[PDB]
Amino acid sequence: SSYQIAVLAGDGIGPEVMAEARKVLKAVEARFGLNIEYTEYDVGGIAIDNHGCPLPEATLKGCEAADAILFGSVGGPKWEKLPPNEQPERGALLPLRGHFELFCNLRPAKLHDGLEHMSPLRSDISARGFDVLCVRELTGGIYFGKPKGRQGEGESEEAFDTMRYSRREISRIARIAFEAARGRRKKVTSVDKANVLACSVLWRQVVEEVAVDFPDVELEHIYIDNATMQLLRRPDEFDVMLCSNLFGDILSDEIAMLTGSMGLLASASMNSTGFGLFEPAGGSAPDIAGKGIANPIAQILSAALMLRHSLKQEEAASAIERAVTKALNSGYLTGELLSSDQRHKAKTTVQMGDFIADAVKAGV
Amino acid sequence: SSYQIAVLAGDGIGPEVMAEARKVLKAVEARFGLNIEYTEYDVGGIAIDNHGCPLPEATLKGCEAADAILFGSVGGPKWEKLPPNEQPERGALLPLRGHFELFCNLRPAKLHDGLEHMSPLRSDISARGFDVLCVRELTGGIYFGKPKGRQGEGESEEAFDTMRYSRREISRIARIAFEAARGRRKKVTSVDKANVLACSVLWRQVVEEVAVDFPDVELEHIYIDNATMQLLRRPDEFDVMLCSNLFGDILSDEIAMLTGSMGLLASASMNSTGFGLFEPAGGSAPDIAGKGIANPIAQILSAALMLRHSLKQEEAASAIERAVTKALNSGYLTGELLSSDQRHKAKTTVQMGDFIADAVKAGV
Numbered sequence: 264s265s266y267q268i269a270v271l272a273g274d275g276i277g278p279e280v281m282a283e284a285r286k287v288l289k290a291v292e293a294r295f296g297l298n299i300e301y302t303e304y305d306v307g308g309i310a311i312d313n314h315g316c317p318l319p320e321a322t323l324k325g326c327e328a329a330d331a332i333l334f335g336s337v338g339g340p341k342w343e344k345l346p347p348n349e350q351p352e353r354g355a356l357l358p359l360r361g362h363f364e365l366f367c368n369l370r371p372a373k374l375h376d377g378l379e380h381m382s383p384l385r386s387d388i389s390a391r392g393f394d395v396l397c398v399r400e401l402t403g404g405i406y407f408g409k410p411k412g413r414q415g416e417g418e419s420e421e422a423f424d425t426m427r428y429s430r431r432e433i434s435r436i437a438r439i440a441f442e443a444a445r446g447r448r449k450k451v452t453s454v455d456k457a458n459v460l461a462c463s464v465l466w467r468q469v470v471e472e473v474a475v476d477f478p479d480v481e482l483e484h485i486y487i488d489n490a491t492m493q494l495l496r497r498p499d500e501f502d503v504m505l506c507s508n509l510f511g512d513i514l515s516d517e518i519a520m521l522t523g524s525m526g527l528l529a530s531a532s533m534n535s536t537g538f539g540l541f542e543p544a545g546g547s548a549p550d551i552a553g554k555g556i557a558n559p560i561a562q563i564l565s566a567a568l569m570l571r572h573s574l575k576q577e578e579a580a581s582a583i584e585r586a587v588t589k590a591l592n593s594g595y596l597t598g599e600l601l602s603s604d605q606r607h608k609a610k611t612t613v614q615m616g617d618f619i620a621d622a623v624k625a626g627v
Numbered sequence: 628s629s630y631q632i633a634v635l636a637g638d639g640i641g642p643e644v645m646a647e648a649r650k651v652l653k654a655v656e657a658r659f660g661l662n663i664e665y666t667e668y669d670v671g672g673i674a675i676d677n678h679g680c681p682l683p684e685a686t687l688k689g690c691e692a693a694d695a696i697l698f699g700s701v702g703g704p705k706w707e708k709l710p711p712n713e714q715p716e717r718g719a720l721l722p723l724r725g726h727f728e729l730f731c732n733l734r735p736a737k738l739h740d741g742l743e744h745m746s747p748l749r750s751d752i753s754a755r756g757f758d759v760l761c762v763r764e765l766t767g768g769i770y771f772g773k774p775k776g777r778q779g780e781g782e783s784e785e786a787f788d789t790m791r792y793s794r795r796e797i798s799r800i801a802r803i804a805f806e807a808a809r810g811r812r813k814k815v816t817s818v819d820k821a822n823v824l825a826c827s828v829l830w831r832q833v834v835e836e837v838a839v840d841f842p843d844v845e846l847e848h849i850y851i852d853n854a855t856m857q858l859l860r861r862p863d864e865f866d867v868m869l870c871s872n873l874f875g876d877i878l879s880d881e882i883a884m885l886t887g888s889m890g891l892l893a894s895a896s897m898n899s900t901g902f903g904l905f906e907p908a909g910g911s912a913p914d915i916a917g918k919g920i921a922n923p924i925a926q927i928l929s930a931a932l933m934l935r936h937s938l939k940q941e942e943a944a945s946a947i948e949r950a951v952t953k954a955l956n957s958g959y960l961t962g963e964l965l966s967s968d969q970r971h972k973a974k975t976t977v978q979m980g981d982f983i984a985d986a987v988k989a990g991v
C-alpha cells in the first residue's frame with residue numbers, strides 16, 4: 264500500500280533542499296518499488312504570511328493523516344520582531360512534538376573521512392575522528408512542565424518554569440539509548456545535574472534501573488557542565504549520549520558544531536508507534552536561499568532516516584546513505600565544505616541532488 | 628585595621644596550592660603594609676572525615692566572622708559513593724552561596740599570549756585570541772527554587788524542580804554585567820532560552836530595561852544552544868556574557884576548556900556588601916596531590932580577586948596579576964602547560980610560588 268508523507272518545507276533554503284530530497288526519493292521509489300504519495304503544507308514563516316499562524320489547522324490535520332513528516336527549516340529575520348514566543352520555530356515545533364508525542368529525538372553526528380579539517384577542533388584531536396549519537400528526550404522536562412508563567416508586578420514580578428519527569432518517561436527514552444548502543448560501540452553516557460536537580464537524581468536512578476536489561480552495554484554518568492568540556496578533549500570516547508530535554512538541546516548543538524559540517528547532519532523525532540518528523544539539523548539560512556548554493560545533504564539524509572525509522576525500509580535508507588558517501592568521496596562538495604582557495608570547485612544544490620539520485624539509480 | 632580571612636583549603640591539591648597563595652600574600656602584605664589575619668577551617672571531604680559533614684557549624688561561623696573566604700577545591704573518589712546529593716562539592720558550595728547571598732559569580736577567562744596552542748581550538752581560531760568574562764547569577768533560578776522534590780511511586784513516580792526569577796534578582800546581576808562591560812569592550816551578550824522558558828522571557832525583558840542606563844554598551848541576546856556553538860567559531864567576538872544560574876554553569880565550563888589552561892583561571896562569588904568567596908576554577912585533582920606538580924596560579928589569582936573585590940586593595944591585586952604575567956613570560960611554567968617533549972623544563976608548585984612572591988617583593 265501507498266505511504267503518505269506530509270511535506271513541510273518551510274522557509275529560507277527549505278524548499279530548494281526539499282526539491283533535491285524529493286528527487287532522490289523518486290530514484291529510491293523506482294529502484295525499490297515503493298508507492299509514496301506526498302502532500303505539501305505551509306509551516307513556519309510562510310504559514311504566518313499565508314495563514315496568520317506558524318502551524319495552521321489544515322497543516323496539523325494533514326500531518327495526522329500521514330505516515331511521516333518530512334520537514335525543512337523554519338524562521339528568518341522577517342519574523343524575529345515577533346516576540347521569541349510567537350516566532351515560527353517554536354510556534355511550529357513545540358506543538359508538533361506535543362501533539363504527536365514525539366518523545367524520542369535522535370541526532371547522529373560524525374566526522375566524515377577527509378573532512379576532519381572543517382572541524383573547529385585542533386587538528387590532532389579532529390584527526391582521531393568521532394561518531395556520537397545524541398538521544399534527547401523531547402516531550403518532558405522543563406519544556407512542557409506546569410506550572411509555567413508569571414505573577415506579581417514591578418520589582419517582585421516573577422517568572423517560573425517547572426522541570427518534571429516521571430520514571431515512565433525516563434525509562435522509555437533510556438531503553439532507546441541502550442538499544443542503540445547495542446548496535447554501535449556498546450556505551451551509553453547519561454548526562455545530568457544530579458548534584459543539584461531532583462529530576463536528575465531520578466534520571467540517574469532510573470537509567471541505572473534500565474541498565475539491568477543490558478549487561479553488555481557500558482553505562483557512565485557525567486554532569487552537563489563537565490560534558491561540555493570533555494567533548495572538546497575526547498569526543499572520540501563517546502558513543503551514545505543520553506540527555507533530558509534541555510540538556511540535549513544544548514549538547515546536541517555543541518556536538519553538531521564540532522563536526523564543522525552541519526550541512527551533513529539530520530535529525531529524527533519519533534513516537535512509540537514509529538511516526539516521526541525528520542529534519543536537517545541546521546537552520547533556514549535565509550541569506551543563501553534562492554542561489555543554488557545550499558547543501559542538500561542534510562535534507563536527503565533526513566529522508567533516509569524517515570525511510571528507516573517510520574517506513575521500515577532499511578534497504579532504501581541505506582542506499583541513500585551510500586549515495587551520499589559516494590558524493591563526498593568523489594569530490595562532489597558544496598561551497599561551505601571547501602577551503603576558500605578551493606571555492607570554485609563547489610557544486611551547486613542541483614548538481615548534488617542529480618549526482619546522488621543518479622548514484623541511487625545506478626545501484627550504489 | 629586587621630582584615631580577617633577564612634581559609635578553606637579543602638581536598639586534593641587545595642592545601643598545596645593554598646600554601647603558595649599564602650606565600651604570595653605575605654609578600655603583598657609586606658609591600659603594601661596590609662594587616663591580614665588568617666584562620667583555617669575544614670570543608671569538603673576533609674570535613675566529612677573529621678566532622679561528619681562537608682560544612683561544619685564551626686566553619687560556617689568562622690566564615691561569618693571573616694571579611695572574605697579564600698577557598699581551595701573540594702571532592703575526590705573517596706566520597707563519590709556518597710549519593711551525588713551528599714557529596715562534598717554540593718554540600719559545601721550551595722549552602723555557602725545560599726547563606727551569604729552570593730548572587731554574583733565572575734569567571735574571567737582569557738587565552739594568554741604564547742599559550743594559544745594549548746587551546747583545543749583549531750590553530751587559526753585560537754591565534755585570534757579571546758578574553759571573555761562570564762557573569763553568572765548564583766542564588767536564584769532552578770538551583771534554589773521551590774517546590775523541589777518528588778512524589779508518587781513506581782512508574783508514575785515523578786520529580787520536579789522549579790526555576791524561578793524575579794525582576795529584582797535579574798536587574799541586580801544585569802547591572803553588574805553592564806558595569807563590567809563598560810570597563811572592558813562595551814559589549815554584553817545575554818544568554819537565555821526565551822523561545823521556551825517563561826524565566827527567559829522575563830530575563831530578556833529585564834535586561835533590556837537595565838540597558839537604558841548604559842547607552843554606551845552594546846547589548847545582544849543569544850539562545851543557550853546557539854551560544855555553545857558560537858563560542859567555537861568566534862570566541863574573540865564576545866566580551867561580557869551574562870547568564871542565569873544553570874546556563875552560566877554550563878557555559879563557563881565550556882569557555883574554561885577553550886583556554887586549554889584551567890590552572891590559570893580563578894572565580895569570584897560575591898554579595899552586594901562586597902563579601903565573597905574566591906576559588907580556582909578547576910577541581911581538586913586528587914591524583915596529583917602531594918607531588919609538587921600542581922599549578923598554583925589559579926589559587927594565587929583567586930587571592931588577587933579577593934584583594935580587589937572584597938578588600939578594595941586594587942594596587943595589591945594588580946601587583947599579583949603582573950607577577951603572574953612575569954612568570955608566564957619568563958618560562959616559569961608547570962607541566963600541564965608544556966608540550967610533553969618540553970616536560971622536563973616544568974617548574975614545581977613551590978618554584979612557581981617562590982618566583983611569584985619574589986617578583987611581588989621586587990616591585991613588579
Ligand SMILES: CC(C)[C@H](C(=O)O)[C@@H](O)C(=O)O
Nearest residue numbers: 352353356357512822823852
Ligand atoms: C526552536 C527550539 C524550540 C528548539 C528546541 O529548543 O528544542 C530548537 O532549539 C531545537 O534544538 O530543535
Ligand SMILES: CC(C)[C@H](C(=O)O)[C@@H](O)C(=O)O
Nearest residue numbers: 458459488716717720721876
Ligand atoms: C558543585 C556544583 C553544585 C557547582 C554548580 O553547579 O554551581 C559547580 O558545578 C560549579 O560550577 O561551581
Ligand SMILES: [Mg+2]
Nearest residue numbers: 512513516852
Ligand atoms: Mg536547539
Ligand SMILES: [Mg+2]
Nearest residue numbers: 488876877880
Ligand atoms: Mg559547574
